[PDB]
Design a binder for this molecule. Structure first.
Ligand SMILES: COc1cc(-c2cncc(-c3ccc(C4CCN(C)CC4)cc3)c2C)cc(OC)c1OC
Ligand SMILES: COc1cc(-c2cncc(-c3ccc(C4CCN(C)CC4)cc3)c2C)cc(OC)c1OC
Ligand SMILES: COc1cc(-c2cncc(-c3ccc(C4CCN(C)CC4)cc3)c2C)cc(OC)c1OC
Length: 283
């Protein structure tokens, strides 16, 4: 039988130190193709090892299609092939759109749903998985208004994370590295930051905040590890909650939820399952 493997690369939709992502075509259908830099080969290996262990299938996890290694004259080419989400990342989307109550809740509940699926161990199933680099650039927007979580190149099953989103125990190097729940609690911190990024773009009483990344007002672009440790650990700053949120019941509830993802004590933070329940009861 014929095994059609040709993928037509059509449009570069992302370039970075990681390598590149392309819109491609296979058998008349869009796929996304991540081409890894030699610098980031371990991310391909880790995501490939995870998918060889457990074939994750969830509406709020970027859908796996293939991992490909191809021999070249003097190098190895590493591709990850996934579902293609034409609306692009949540980071991108929040810069060109404001949200209503229903669209804000649908976005954050879908992220919580993907994250709880990663975190939960299922017997007879899947191992528990922590993401370790959750951020708005690693979330894609789907046409149905839900999102999905992308990039399991740092994930751990039961490169460092993006510094702007690191939890205090990562920055002060007190994280209990031998304890898997520690990694879930680092994802919850990052989730709270993503919640804040999205909530800012929800309109209430004719008011909205401009898109900003977490800590935009207290650290530079490409903040150093020390820049982040001083803000998050030494001064114990957290993102600002604008007064206008407290006129809106949804943003008032979301502010409370963010606070419960940002405790200094990792053990005090909400679980992804509790976040899901809280979001289902909002509105
Ligand atoms: C190797 O490489 C790539 C392959 C493909 C691809 C193309 N046609 C058919 C297939 C196929 C799937 C599954 C079976 C099964 C059938 C039932 N039987 C009991 C076991 C075998 C056979 C064939 C594949 C996997 C696509 C690719 O890219 C999208 C590939 O490159 C990454
Ligand atoms: C990698 O990705 C894609 C692959 C394919 C594809 C191509 N040929 C054959 C298959 C296939 C057939 C049959 C079995 C099973 C069926 C029951 N039992 C007998 C076990 C074996 C498995 C697999 C597939 C799934 C299509 C896709 O899209 C339409 C893919 O997605 C881009
Ligand atoms: C974060 O991580 C990964 C993401 C993806 C991924 C999947 N669907 C769609 C995209 C995308 C498409 C289109 C735009 C633009 C282009 C058109 N217009 C000018 C604005 C919108 C942006 C982004 C991506 C980047 C794939 C990955 O691997 C294959 C990723 O890595 C795991």
């Amino acid at each position: 039988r014929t095994v059609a493997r040709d993928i037509t690369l059509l449009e570069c939709v992302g370039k970075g130190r990681y390598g590149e992502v392309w819109r491609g075509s296979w058998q008349g259908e869009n796929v996304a193709v991540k081409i890894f830099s030699s610098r980031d080969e371990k991310s391909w290996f880790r995501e490939t090892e995870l998918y060889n262990t457990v074939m994750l299938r969830h509406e709020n996890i970027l859908g796996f299609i293939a991992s490909d290694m191809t021999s070249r004259h003097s190098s190895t080419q590493l591709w990850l092939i996934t579902h293609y989400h034409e609306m692009g990342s949540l980071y991108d989307y929040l810069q060109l759109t404001t949200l209503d109550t229903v669209s804000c809740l649908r976005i954050v509940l879908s992220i919580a749903s993907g994250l709880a699926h990663l975190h939960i161990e299922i017997f007879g199933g899947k191992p528990a998985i922590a993401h370790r680099d959750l951020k708005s650039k690693n979330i894609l927007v789907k046409k149905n208004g839900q999102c999905c979580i992308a990039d399991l190149g740092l994930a751990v099953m039961h490169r460092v994370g993006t510094k702007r989103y690191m939890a205090p125990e990562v920055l002060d190097e007190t994280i209990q590295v031998d304890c898997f729940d520690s990694y879930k609690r680092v994802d919850i911190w990052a989730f709270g930051l993503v919640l804040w990024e999205v909530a800012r773009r929800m309109v209430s009483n004719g008011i909205v905040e401009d898109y900003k990344p977490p800590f935009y007002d207290v650290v530079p672009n490409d903040p150093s590890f020390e820049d982040m440790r001083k803000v998050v650990c030494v001064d114990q700053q957290r993102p600002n909650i604008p007064n206008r949120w407290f006129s809106d019941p949804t943003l008032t509830s979301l502010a409370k939820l963010m606070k419960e993802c940002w405790y200094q004590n990792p053990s005090a933070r909400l679980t992804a399952l509790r976040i899901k329940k809280t979001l289902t009861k909002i509105d």
